[PDB]
Amino acid sequence: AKRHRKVLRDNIQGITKPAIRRLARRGGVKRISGLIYEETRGVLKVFLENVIRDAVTYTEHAKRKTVTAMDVVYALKRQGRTLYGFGG
Template sequence: MEIPFRSQKFLAKTAGFMPRRHRKPDRDNIMGITRPAIRRLARRGGVKRMQKAIYETTRDVVLDRLRLIIRQLVDVLESADTNGKGRKTVTTRDVVYVLQRLGSPIYGFGTTMSLR
């Protein structure tokens, strides 16, 4: 069976593979926090059993916390005045500072910084 408008040379060059014409449907990125991941975190915290609704609630809590942290990070970067412009790159030091400012310090990233 011959494919119209396609030469044999073209098919040999592409090995029969054509580029995708349709994109995969986008899914919400928060769904990347999977049920098994939530279950592992809960197990580490000592939870034995969970209701089905806890997964969606956990995702909502994580999303709210991330929004708060990112909002604080933007404030830190905008306040870093360099020639009248804020910085654009977030460093680990910025994240450690923001988490400490929010009252949940992260361990293993050097000495604690003064908030004054």
């Protein structure tokens, strides 16, 4: 059976275990428990869906289908997570 779907759904597992370990090494974490990665994936999904929902709202105010970087900058700016290096 060669049947499979075109749309992939396990891309939250695309944030791999050594990526989360590198993130914690940048955060200064020495030892990591085995249950950390699923919680980190859920937290990343929640944060990403919040920012992307605001960016999509900013895009469809402008009657556009393309999410620009400035919409992401405004979406991060409204929640108090202002980002430099893309505003201009």
